[PDB]
Symmetry: none
Subunit: 146 residues, 2 copies
């Protein structure tokens, strides 16, 4: 697969009042897993200010600005579940329950987004992912990705 | 959700830069009745936010959510660059197929999924990158879902 997924980068049952909080958490986990340098966290926050990374269907995919390309050490993701949701889009009902922090090498974030959206094209699967308490079930459900 | 005919197929194009290719794609989405002229700038702006090189010789420049009301009808422009256009950060990050997308809100996601699944076969990309036939393009992309 394009990126690894396991208990080390799956975070369930999180809560956040704001998307800045969820983004920072995702960024911190990308730093901790060796995917990016610490400067990438602010790059994710800066990128969000330019335009929201909500993708519709309760999913948001925060990632770094193009200027932060060299802060990415290796491609990876952090899957973060917010069962109560976090507003990510422009409007108040633009809520994300799945916040997947993305770091692809060479600014190729769209390739990781595309893998994820190709795999997460079922309403019912997204619903199960937003509430499951099992890391193994997350792994099963995202097993078809590129 | 996208129609394909000779009008939105552009074979044998050349461009020195990805910005030129994106502008050409945007201009043809304007000409084809898919989008208003402000969408061209939205495509260039999207490219500065999240580059649209998918790998395997494909790029899918699209607009922003902010420019959704500048979309008049959903659709694509299939632009072939047989000599390639660099869309990624490194030398070999070349696109021979630049598919500009007119989609509102986050509807580009489903368009990209459709294209991604229609272009899984490497031989299909190769034939599309170099064919001189509209008929063959239409046939090669008829399996899109």
């Amino acid at each position: 697969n394009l990126f690894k997924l396991g208990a080390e980068n799956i975070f369930l049952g999180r809560k956040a009042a704001t998307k800045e909080e969820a983004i920072r958490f995702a960024g911190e986990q990308l730093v901790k897993g060796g995917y990016v340098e610490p400067e990438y966290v602010q790059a994710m926050l800066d990128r969000e200010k330019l335009t929201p990374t909500y993708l519709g269907e309760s999913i948001a995919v925060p990632h770094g600005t193009v200027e932060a390309k060299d802060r990415v050490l290796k491609t990876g993701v952090v899957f973060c579940q917010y069962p109560e949701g976090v507003r990510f889009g422009e409007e108040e009902d633009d809520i994300a329950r799945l916040v997947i922090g993305i770091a692809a090498r060479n600014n190729e974030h769209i390739q990781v987004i595309t893998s994820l959206t190709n795999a997460l094209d079922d309403e019912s699967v997204i619903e199960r992912l937003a509430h499951t308490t099992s890391v193994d079930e997350v792994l099963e459900l995202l097993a078809g990705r590129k």
